[PDB]
DNA sequence: ATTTTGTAGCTACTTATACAAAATTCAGGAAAATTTTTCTGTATAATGGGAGCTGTCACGGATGCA
């Protein structure tokens, strides 16, 4: 699923998120670069790749 | 005219004492008996775990900063 959202101004990132049935997750987004990070749990990770 | 009252009396007569050893039991001891708790070894070889959780807040900090 995807959830995007705003900053305090209107910087409107997005995200993404995955859920297995069972097993860990995979998170994504866009942090005022437009450039992104494969977070795993909440924000566990964060990699341009 | 007996009877109850007597008085002047005891003796029998029986508590009372106090001791008293004898019981007679009791407790504690002592084992000793034994039951239960401990202690120790074990030889092919063996060499990083488990989990997940993922929806407030705040604040003060937040040093960290670019």
From Swiss-Prot:
The chain holds residues 148 to 196 of 1131 of the full protein. In cyanobacteria the RNAP catalytic core is composed of 2 alpha, 1 beta, 1 beta', 1 gamma and 1 omega subunit. When a sigma factor is associated with the core the holoenzyme is formed, which can initiate transcription. It comes from Nostoc sp. (strain PCC 7120 / SAG 25.82 / UTEX 2576). Belongs to the RNA polymerase beta chain family. It comes from the Bacteria. The lineage of its organism: Bacteria, Bacillati, Cyanobacteriota, Cyanophyceae, Nostocales. DNA-dependent RNA polymerase catalyzes the transcription of DNA into RNA using the four ribonucleoside triphosphates as substrates. This is DNA-directed RNA polymerase subunit beta.
């Amino acid at each position: 699923y995807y959830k995007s959202e705003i900053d305090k101004n209107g910087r409107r990132t997005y995200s993404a998120s995955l859920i297995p049935n069972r097993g860990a997750w995979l998170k994504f987004e866009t942090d005022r670069n437009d450039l992104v990070w494969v977070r795993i749990d909440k924000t566990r990770k964060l990699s341009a790749q």
